[PDB]
Design a protein around this ligand. Structure first.
Ligand SMILES: CCCCCCCCCCCCCCCCCC(=O)OC[C@H](COP(=O)([O-])OCC(O)COP(=O)([O-])OC[C@@H](COC(=O)CCCCCCCCCCCCCCCCC)OC(=O)CCCCCCCCCCCCCCCCC)OC(=O)CCCCCCCCCCCCCCCCC
Ligand SMILES: CCCCCCCCCCCCCCCCCC(=O)OC[C@H](COP(=O)([O-])OCC[N+](C)(C)C)OC(=O)CCCCCCCCCCCCCCCCC
Ligand code: SF4
Ligand code: SF4
Ligand SMILES: [Zn+2]
Lengths: 49, 115, 179, 209, 176, 45, 96, 115, 95
């Protein structure tokens, strides 16, 4: 059951990262696929989590 | 005041005695030093140079100063043969990288305001 | 940080708490090392009975700290000559009885634990008060006092340009640095 | 302490050291010229230059001294003294938890017979006193340079020696070797004269001379 | 007080020696090393994803220096000249002149990043807290000349990091 | 205002363990050899 | 503000200006000369002149602890608006 | 006395199984060599004071375990080592003979810090 | 922390100890990085009553070394009492 939840969380990462495109984008641009709440944004496009 | 301690030598005779074999040793070492250290200078250059630093201080009178500087001059020949120094440490004695400093009065006057 | 006359600044609020959390978990990390190395044959055989020295040669050679305590020499600066507040705290000096490489290793890891003892005691007995001496001639005045009082400004000026003049003399002070 | 600002003093150790100061003095009225116990419970035994072995062997093996820990040996180059160098031994007693300081005056040429026999710790602790200062130590196993560069010239800790020295290195592409040249700095040392013209603490003032 | 660290009394009963023989023959203690290191294999790493996340710092951090200025805009530095006097590396070099207004400030505040020590004495030096170290530490470069700073470069950095250091000294000046 | 500076909690921080906590685990030496021999005769059989 | 030299060479508040030849300017090309566009002199001059009716006025400069060492500049010279040395703010007093 | 302690806790220094009489015969020896140095000597008076006095109970009290606090100088097995050191000193300063006045008064004011 | 229970038993069993009690990294336990402003104490001699520097002169109260014997029936003493053999550890004497 625990492994099922972890797999569920893994799929939620893809959904959180705007589907497939964002998930592949962040993985090949930041080596991170962990998603957190939006916290702010400067006048530059720098997404902050 | 005049009476003082002979760190190794009573008289300049035994002081000049000390400089002799060290001079003999320094002249024997030249062919092997240049060989293993892999230099480009000639054996005679070492000999006539080993000549050189023996003379600029060949004017002292206190037998302590000469014989203390004897152990000073003692203190590189072994530092060479046991390859302790580098190539840069004995071409340093062959000061060559610099321009030849000015000798006539006019040349110093031309270079700058420094005697 | 450690300046003549005390310390330069005071700790940020709550710093004692975070270091306390580290102190609780650190003893586990020491156990981690001892599990890893202490009983391992390969480590011992590369370390035990290696580089042994007698007590007399170790002392005559000018050695200090673990180099003596590993060889069984009964000596430690914090205990014999307690500087600062080291007298108002107890700690078990880990004296070995072989003098080889292994004895010093166990001597160090116990000194790790005994160091952790000092953290615990000073943490539960941290007194209030100022961080530097109350003498502007050797301690720069507080920034707030700097910008309102003349004598603070003069003393701050002369301390940061000329500095305090130390009375003449000589002194060889000694502390047990972990080396 | 009623006055927490000033450091408390320990008088009990003060005369106890003073008692031991006279103690060693009476054994060797030939060597011990001066004994001094400072304010901070530090005792100093001023000895003659040829006393490096005797008094140290005394302090090392005595029943009431047992000072077998050689802390350090240092020189204090004082130009204004006819004996510029001042070799200073520091001794520590495990049994009596005390410290011993002995100083010997010495000129440049005048040698000091090595104390290696007394303490073998001094073996390495002379190879730099010859390096930094230039005081030669007699009957010593080796006097090799271990701080100055290989073939470096001079004794840097001497106060006639500049802080920047004389030689500066640089790799030279002409000869494929780093070579030395006379030192020229990007910026010179902006020395500061911080000795205030108004007198300091009057206790240590020199008498009218 | 003190304690021994190597006094081992291996009991010579038939029990303990069997354990000792078991230890040597079957590499029990070595297996502990395997099981010990295996334990952290199955544990999370603590590897910060730089530069997507940095290390934790404190308001007292000392980094790239930056000369600040008052809320009005006038520079804080007043030819105080204390900063280089207390600077233990002599990186600061400052020369003042008369100024047209009479608020005679300096023309030069060259501090060599390859000479300074990030001592912390700089802010403690000038009473008007003119020069402070900004929290920046990524001011790396490729030519040695750029590390040599000058009065324009510091003042520009002061105008850059002004948003940060102002809050840093805001939450730390009580300690100072 | 009253003096506020970093101080321990009024009861002090909790106790900090400092012993060596090396775990006494594993089987007895005879059991090690017993099973070690035990799996053997299974293999030959 | 900031001015422009004959070679462009945006002058600094100090007044540094490389000459026509001035071979040292070769380090400037292919790069940029760092200039602080904000000049100290003309960002304090336009600041409003404070009107405080007293002979002696403290000049801590805002945030006494965080400002500059407080001065007690005199305000009696009616010709010249008395200003703090550290602050540079020009304090004037209305008609004594 | 009692059971012979296995180790002294100081590597290199071993346990002597007959310590009391070794300490005895040492203490007489330093008393013996102290016969040579004349009576007026202060070093003689100092160690003729702590030898016989410390030879007292080691002659009387035979228990080395109690001898630890009789001498307050740690373990007996290194007390005899220290006693040997005192014997070495007696041999050494039988040459030194420091009872003469100073060899030299200190040249002018070489002392008197500060300068 | 993230780590599921089955992993935790594997880590706990392999290391022979429980690790969820204390971990190498940090978590919410740390103090927040926006601690309230402090109110640092004043000096012991900060009083505006009698506080003359004539009392505390640590630098000035120093004295040049005391002259005891200069070149220009007895007892035997030691520079300090001989050290005291400290006892074994009460918590754990034999490690
Ligand atoms: C060997 C055992 C089988 C493979 C590993 C199985 C596994 O990890 O199962 C999940 C799960 C992870 O547990 P954990 O390591 O404690 O999780 C820590 C955090 O909760 C982890 O929290 P989280 O939020 O980081 O979890 C998200 C995670 C979730 O990841 C998973 O669930 C792993 C499975 C792939 C998705 O997915 C990602 O991080 C996305 C990146 C994936 C990288 C590439 C993964 C390759 C997998 C294998 C490919 C084929 C070979 O496994 C277990 O709990 C026990 C082991 C497996 C038991 C199931 C039967 C086998
Ligand atoms: C997913 C993967 C799951 C399996 C991972 C590997 C498991 C085994 C390695 C980790 C062991 C962790 C430490 C442990 O349990 O120690 C217990 C104990 C700790 O013992 P000890 O060192 O405390 O000593 C106690 C036992 N006496 C006194 C008798 C020595 O060690 C053992 O039980 C040893 C087990 C290994 C034996 C290796 C030799 C035989 C190999 C045969 C072929 C395979
Ligand atoms: S930066 Fe500070 S110390 Fe330096 S001159 Fe300016 S005010 Fe003085
Ligand atoms: S940068 Fe560091 S070394 Fe340089 S002046 Fe400032 S504090 Fe001193
Ligand atoms: Zn002002």
């Amino acid at each position: 059951m625990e492994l099922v939840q972890v797999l569920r969380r893994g799929l939620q990462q893809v959904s959180g990262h705007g589907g497939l495109r964002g998930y592949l984008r962040v993985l090949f641009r930041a080596n991170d696929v962990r998603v957190g709440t939006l916290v702010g944004e400067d006048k530059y496009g720098n997404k902050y989590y | 005041g005049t009476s003082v301690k002979p760190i190794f030598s009573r008289d300049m005779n035994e002081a000049k005695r000390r400089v002799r074999e060290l001079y003999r040793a320094w002249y024997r070492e030249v062919p092997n030093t240049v060989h293993l250290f892999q230099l480009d200078i000639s054996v005679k250059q070492g000999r006539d140079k080993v000549r050189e630093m023996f003379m600029k201080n060949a004017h002292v009178t206190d037998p302590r100063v000469v014989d203390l500087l004897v152990i000073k001059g003692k203190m590189e020949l072994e530092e060479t043969i046991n390859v302790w120094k580098q190539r840069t440490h004995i071409m340093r004695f062959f000061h060559e990288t610099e321009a030849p400093r000015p000798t006539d009065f006019l040349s110093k006057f031309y270079v700058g305001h420094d005697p | 940080y450690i300046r003549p006359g005390g310390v330069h600044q005071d700790l940020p609020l709550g710093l004692l708490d975070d270091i306390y959390e580290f102190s609780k978990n650190f003893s586990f990390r020491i156990d981690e090392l001892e599990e890893m190395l202490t009983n391992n044959r390969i480590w011992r055989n590369r370390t035990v009975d290696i580089g042994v020295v007698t007590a007399e040669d170790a002392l005559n050679y000018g050695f200090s700290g673990v180099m003596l305590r590993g060889s069984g020499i009964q000596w430690d600066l914090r205990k014999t000559q307690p500087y600062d507040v080291y007298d108002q705290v107890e700690f078990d000096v880990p004296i070995g009885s072989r003098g080889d490489c292994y004895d010093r290793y166990l001597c160090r890891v116990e000194e790790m634990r005994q160091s952790l003892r000092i953290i615990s005691q000073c943490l539960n007995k941290m007194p209030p008060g100022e961080i530097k001496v109350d003498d502007a001639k050797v301690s720069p005045p507080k920034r707030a006092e700097m910008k309102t009082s003349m004598e603070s400004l003069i003393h701050h000026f002369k301390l940061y340009t000329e500095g305090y003049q130390v009375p003449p003399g000589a002194t060889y002070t000694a502390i047990e640095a972990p080396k | 302490d009623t006055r927490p600002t000033i450091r408390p003093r320990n008088d009990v150790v003060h005369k106890q050291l003073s008692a031991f100061g006279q103690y060693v003095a009476e054994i060797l009225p030939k060597y011990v010229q001066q004994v001094q116990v400072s304010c901070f419970n530090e005792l100093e035994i001023f000895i003659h230059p040829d006393g490096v072995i005797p008094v140290l062997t005394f302090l090392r093996d005595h029943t009431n001294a047992q000072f077998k820990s050689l802390a350090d040996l240092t020189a204090v180059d004082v130009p204004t003294r006819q004996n510029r160098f001042e070799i200073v031994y520091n001794l520590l007693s495990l049994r009596f938890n005390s410290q011993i300081r002995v100083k010997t005056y010495t000129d440049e040429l005048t040698p000091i017979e090595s104390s290696v026999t007394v303490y073998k710790a001094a073996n390495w602790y002379e190879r730099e006193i010859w390096d930094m200062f230039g005081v030669f130590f007699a009957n010593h196993p080796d006097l090799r340079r271990i701080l100055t560069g290989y073939g470096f010239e001079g004794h840097p800790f001497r106060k006639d020696f500049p802080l920047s020295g004389y030689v500066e290195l640089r790799y030279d592409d002409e000869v494929k070797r780093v070579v030395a040249e006379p030192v020229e700095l990007a910026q010179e040392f902006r020395k500061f004269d911080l000795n205030s013209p108004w007198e300091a603490f009057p206790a240590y003032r020199q008498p009218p001379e | 007080t003190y304690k021994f660290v190597n006094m081992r009394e291996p009991s010579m009963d038939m029990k303990s020696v069997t354990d000792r023989a078991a230890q040597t023959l079957l590499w029990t203690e070595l297996v502990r090393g395997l099981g010990m290191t295996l334990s952290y294999l199955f544990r999370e790493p603590a590897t910060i994803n730089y530069p997507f996340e940095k290390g934790p710092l404190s308001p007292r951090f000392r980094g790239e220096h930056a000369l600040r200025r008052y809320p009005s805009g006038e520079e804080r530095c007043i030819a105080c000249k204390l900063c280089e006097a207390v600077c233990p590396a002599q990186a600061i070099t400052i020369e003042a002149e008369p100024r047209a207004d009479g608020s005679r400030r300096t023309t030069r505040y060259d501090i060599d990043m390859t000479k300074c020590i990030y001592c912390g004495f700089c802010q403690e030096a000038c009473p008007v807290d003119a020069i402070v170290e900004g929290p920046n530490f990524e001011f790396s470069t490729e030519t040695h000349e750029e590390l040599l700073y000058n009065k324009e470069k510091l003042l520009n950095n002061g105008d850059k990091w002004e948003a940060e250091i102002a809050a840093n000294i805001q939450a730390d000046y009580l300690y100072r | 205002s009253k003096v506020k500076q970093d101080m321990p909690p009024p009861g002090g921080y909790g106790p900090i363990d400092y012993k060596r906590n090396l775990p006494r685990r594993g089987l007895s030496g005879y059991s090690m050899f017993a099973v070690g021999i035990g799996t053997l005769l299974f293999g030959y059989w | 503000g900031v001015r422009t030299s004959p070679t462009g060479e945006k002058v600094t508040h100090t007044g540094q200006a490389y000459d026509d030849g001035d071979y040292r300017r070769v380090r400037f090309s292919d790069r940029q000369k760092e200039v602080n566009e904000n000049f100290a002199i003309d960002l304090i001059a336009e600041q409003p002149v404070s009107e405080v009716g007293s002979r002696v006025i403290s000049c801590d400069g805002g945030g006494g602890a965080l400002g500059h060492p407080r001065v007690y500049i005199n305000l009696d010279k009616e010709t010249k608006t008395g200003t703090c040395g550290y602050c540079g703010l020009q304090f004037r007093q209305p008609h004594h | 006395a009692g059971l012979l302690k296995k180790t002294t806790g100081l590597v290199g220094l071993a346990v002597c199984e007959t310590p009391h009489e070794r300490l005895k015969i040492l203490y007489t020896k330093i008393l013996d060599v102290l016969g040579q140095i004349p009576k007026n000597a202060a070093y003689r008076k100092y160690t003729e004071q702590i030898t016989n006095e410390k030879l007292g109970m080691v002659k009387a009290e035979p228990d080395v375990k109690k001898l630890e606090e009789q001498l307050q100088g740690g373990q007996i097995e290194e007390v005899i080592l220290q006693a040997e050191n005192e014997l070495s000193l007696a041999r050494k300063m039988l040459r030194w003979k420091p009872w003469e006045p100073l060899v030299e008064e200190p040249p002018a004011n070489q002392w008197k810090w500060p300068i | 922390a993230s780590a599921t229970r089955v992993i935790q038993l594997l880590r706990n069993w392999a290391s022979g100890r429980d690790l969820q009690a204390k971990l190498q990294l940090r978590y919410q336990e740390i103090s927040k990085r926006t601690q309230p402003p402090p109110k640092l104490p004043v000096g012991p001699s900060h009083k505006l009553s009698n506080n003359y520097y004539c009392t505390r002169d640590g630098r000035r109260e120093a004295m040049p070394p005391s002259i005891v014997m200069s070149s220009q029936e007895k007892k035997a003493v030691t520079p300090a009492p001989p050290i005291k053999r400290w006892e074994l550890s009460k918590d754990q004497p034999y490690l």
